[PDB]
Amino acid sequence: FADAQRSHYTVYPSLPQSNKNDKHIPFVKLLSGKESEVNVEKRWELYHQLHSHFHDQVDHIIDNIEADLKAEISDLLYSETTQKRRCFNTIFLLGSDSTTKIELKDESSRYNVLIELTPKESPNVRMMLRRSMYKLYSAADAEEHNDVSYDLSLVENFKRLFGKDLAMVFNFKDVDSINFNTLDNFIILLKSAFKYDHVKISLIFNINTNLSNIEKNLRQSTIRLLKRNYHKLDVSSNKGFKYGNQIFQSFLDTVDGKLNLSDRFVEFILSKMANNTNHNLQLLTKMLDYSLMSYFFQNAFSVFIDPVNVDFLNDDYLKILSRCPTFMFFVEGLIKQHAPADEILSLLTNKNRGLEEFFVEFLVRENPINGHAKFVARFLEEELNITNFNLIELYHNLLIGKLDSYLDRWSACKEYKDRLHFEPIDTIFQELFTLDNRSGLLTQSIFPSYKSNIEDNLLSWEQVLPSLDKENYDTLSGDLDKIMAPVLGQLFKLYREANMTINIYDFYIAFRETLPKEEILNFIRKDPSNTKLLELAETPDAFDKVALILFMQAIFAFENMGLIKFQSTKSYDLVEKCVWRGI
Amino acid sequence: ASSFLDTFEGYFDQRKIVRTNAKSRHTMSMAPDVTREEFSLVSNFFNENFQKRPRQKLFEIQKKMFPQYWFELTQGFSLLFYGVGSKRNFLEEFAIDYLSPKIAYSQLVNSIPCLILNGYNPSCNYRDVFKEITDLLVPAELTRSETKYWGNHVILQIQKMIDFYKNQPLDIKLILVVHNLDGPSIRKNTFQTMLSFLSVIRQIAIVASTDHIYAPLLWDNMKAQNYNFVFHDISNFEPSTVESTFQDVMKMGKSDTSSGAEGAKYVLQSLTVNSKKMYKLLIETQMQNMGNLSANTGPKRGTQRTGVELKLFNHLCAADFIASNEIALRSMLREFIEHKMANITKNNSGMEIIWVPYTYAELEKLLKTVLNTL
Amino acid sequence: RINTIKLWLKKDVKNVWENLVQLDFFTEKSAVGLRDNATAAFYASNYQFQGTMIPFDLRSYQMQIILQELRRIIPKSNMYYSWTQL
DNA sequence: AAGGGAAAATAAACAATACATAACAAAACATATAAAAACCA
DNA sequence: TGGTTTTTATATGTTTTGTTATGTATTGTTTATTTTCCCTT
């Protein structure tokens, strides 16, 4: 009984005695091992005070998106004094995630029960009622401080058993996932409680998508019941951009004066946040964190955003910052303006003091785009009463210089487009303190081309396995490794060049012609120890049997990856291909 | 053959009608008839000698990635590994040898418990996994107002566990390691819903892996939020000789993939002779009850009705001298229960039925190929 | 060929379509209305049928009263009587 | 520029497979009460 | 020992969930015939 053949076993692993060090942080020494340990632990705690200052405000923001939504739904749930008094007030929550709690009033000489129904809790109509009558009878004995049949006769006996009148509220959670035959028959069932003179029902529909999809599903006589008083409340994190603008402004407050945002990064943020419209704010936070995680892990100059560590500056730091492309443009500008060589030489590395004294000058500039974007977003808010705008693409067009070409769409900033005008200037050494994606890490870690990374490793495979030259002539198979592909990579190019339906036997022979016949049998004989394997190699049928064994574990590995269908069970001779590269 | 090879262009151009004369119908019977024991002989030689030296050097390259993954698990990211080849020996060497001692040192003694989870096993049950997690965390079990009228106690206790652990200190105290998160019994919706809500808990660190190429189709916007994976490509062209154990490779993968009886054939090969004589007696007695009750040749998978009860089974294996008493019977049964080759449950009268979860045709094939050779 | 007759819209015939369903002129396509006993009516309430889940205008229905019966009941003076025969 | 002629399309009869649901089983979830078993006293 | 409370064994009920069989609908397979434009002339 091996643990590899079990499901869900638990290892209590053995830890060594003490590894002599307080080195237990995941940051590594940069500059290929030239960075000191005190820089690594400083870059660790300067990360965590810049990471926690960002999430203390985002947790403050998220607690305001629910406290606003509890209060916005509660202004609208109460006080609509209808004079007809024989219907239910329906609240459609457009685009709402079903993760908002609803607080009802205390409001004595009245019971206010909240009854929440998920589509898993609604298989049919009697299960919607037996849970609804259990949830009100359990929540009325909780406030009370004999048994009842759980049906809608509990609603008529409610004053005759509890002394106070009722006000029950239904909160349907995933109404796009419930079937609408059951929800139609349950609203019609609740319609029978309008003869009791002491109850009022209130329905809340968390419609994630659309109201137009719901009214094509319900019957027409139910919509005429839902229309005596209904209220559409648009509930989204993406409405008016007002909560995405607060998290991105909270990010720019943390990195104000110490990190810059390249426009190649900001429009990546802007494009990936448009591909997910339901859950933006967790995905906005995920991209700003992983880029902030990426900066402090990869830059040795991450310790140079607080000024107290500038008095540390070293020689390998001086060899790596001078290849900044703005710094060469500055030396190019001193060539073209000032002829003599000595002041440029005092800038370069032959003056040991001057270059490190040159870098202490440019760390203290405010770099004022972070406050000016907050200045524009507040000024464009209260003057023009403009709500519907991204601060993210406002910050993106401000990095380029296309600010007034973005403001002309509202057609009311023509008297203010000259006072808000701002052309950004390229500060020196701003490539060393910036967030950018020119390597392609965020669209490989967070948003990978999943299947395209699978077929590229199958087809090419030279980017994956190391092609080494010295060590192979020592080992058992290095005469075979230069002439033979790995079998999943060899079979994939026979897979790729083939048609939809392929015979296994013709696909076996076409595989077998690719292999070297002499060196597979030379490799199968180069082990002298296995007598049972050398006995297979003496047979004339040795290459035809080794090729089939090696074929049909790769034709097996391509099925549970999902690349191959076995068409037409009872037959087992031909297969259909599932997956094409490039798609 | 075709002019285009890869795009939607290659999709539309390779799906042509082939004529009847153009079809070259060769049966796979025109092949070298390969014995199973020389299948294992040639495969274990190529998987242990063909490209070790590239795969060993590749594994030394991506071992330098281990502090970069550990920085991500301390920031609340679950962590999915994809690629071509077996990721199993990567995953349990990273999580046991590297990850678990170094979180424990960074929280200052004993290491973090590392519940690893073989999802290539088609018998992986989500209630047994959650039975294991509540033994490790010991959560406050669910009060009566929290059990909401036939609510699901597995899901409703995770939701109590999230609200508990949102106020606890941010310390990893469990590392659950899911091999093949898109495997056959674990790709189901109730298993993924469990592991997504369980991934919200920042005190436990998810380290998962996937083999299927349409694996991202398995998580919508809500499950990808709760997971919030960071994806890593580890292609290493490893053999997957342990994943090719629960699933017959001689049949090239048409062994139905969800039986679990082919993986039971591997378990019988290294047991005690007194533990195989018991399981043979258990199979033959249930095979009597399947041919009696069903009156049907077709494949129906064996359940509680066809099973032997436990006190009647003790009389059957005391006459054939397998078990001396009830306790020695129950001690050599439970090794089959932990591998789910036999199940014990009680009926509506109190009879404690023991039964084997396989179909009738898989039960007579298993009886002849490993058990009846003695 | 012909004062004029109003053509009701797609959104307005939906109410007319649902009344002919509940008056037993249209039935669901392969439908089992009432079951024999209490356990078969309980097994059907836990199953979630397909016609429930497909959209409204795509449900296949069938016909309680055929057109040859529908010509014989409608009087010869209706303006729709000429359309009770193909 | 014409034209051959093979790929592609159409149709129709037939066989093979998938699908929707009926019928049911079984496990999770739930309550009840007489007998054991602690347990104060 | 002696009453009282608490747990367990036995017994049945409820709701969700997963499996299988089957009649009907869909889809593939083969063969004859017609239209379309690529590749030689």
Swiss-Prot record, chain A:
Positions of disulphide bridges: none
Entry's family note: Belongs to the ORC3 family.
Keyword Nucleus: yes
InterPro entries: EF_Hand_1_Ca_BS, ORC3, ORC3_N, ORC_WH_C
Record keywords, A-Z: Acetylation, DNA replication, DNA-binding, Nucleus
Organism of this sequence: Saccharomyces cerevisiae (strain ATCC 204508 / S288c) (Baker's yeast)
Function text: Component of the origin recognition complex (ORC) that binds origins of replication. It has a role in both chromosomal replication and mating type transcriptional silencing. Binds to the ARS consensus sequence (ACS) of origins of replication.
Subcellular location: Nucleus
GO cellular component: DNA replication preinitiation complex; nuclear origin of replication recognition complex; nuclear pre-replicative complex; nucleoplasm; nucleus
Taxonomic superkingdom: Eukaryota
This protein's name: Origin recognition complex subunit 3
Gene name in the database record: ORC3
PANTHER family tied to this protein: ORIGIN RECOGNITION COMPLEX SUBUNIT 3 (PTHR12748:SF0)
UniProtKB/Swiss-Prot annotation, chain B:
Protein name, entry field: Origin recognition complex subunit 2
Family, similarity comment: Belongs to the ORC2 family.
Subunit structure, interactors included: Component of the origin recognition complex (ORC) composed of at least ORC1, ORC2, ORC3, ORC4, ORC5 and ORC6. Interacts with MCM10 and TAH11.
Record bears the keyword Phosphoprotein: yes
GO cellular component, as recorded: chromosome, telomeric region; DNA replication preinitiation complex; nuclear origin of replication recognition complex; nuclear pre-replicative complex; nucleoplasm; nucleus
Full-length numbering of the shown residues: 236 to 620 of 620
Its biological purpose: Component of the origin recognition complex (ORC) that binds origins of replication. It has a role in both chromosomal replication and mating type transcriptional silencing. Binds to the ARS consensus sequence (ACS) of origins of replication.
Disulfide bridge positions per record: none
Subcellular location: Nucleus
GO molecular function annotations of the record: chromatin binding; DNA replication origin binding
Keywords: DNA replication, Nucleus, Phosphoprotein
Swiss-Prot/TrEMBL GO biological process terms: DNA replication initiation; pre-replicative complex assembly involved in nuclear cell cycle DNA replication; silent mating-type cassette heterochromatin formation; subtelomeric heterochromatin formation
Name of the gene: ORC2
Main subcellular location of this protein, as a coarse class: nucleus
Superkingdom, taxonomy of origin: Eukaryota
Further remark: Present with 1700 molecules/cell in log phase SD medium.
From Swiss-Prot, chain C:
Gene this chain is encoded by: ORC4
Disulfide bonds: none
Superkingdom of the organism of origin: Eukaryota
Compartments, as annotated in UniProt: Nucleus
Protein name as annotated: Origin recognition complex subunit 4
UniProt subunit comment: Component of the origin recognition complex (ORC) composed of at least ORC1, ORC2, ORC3, ORC4, ORC5 and ORC6.
Full-sequence portion shown in this chain: 425 to 529 of 529
Function per UniProt: Component of the origin recognition complex (ORC) that binds origins of replication. It has a role in both chromosomal replication and mating type transcriptional silencing. Binds to the ARS consensus sequence (ACS) of origins of replication.
Remaining remarks: Present with 2170 molecules/cell in log phase SD medium.
Family: Belongs to the ORC4 family.
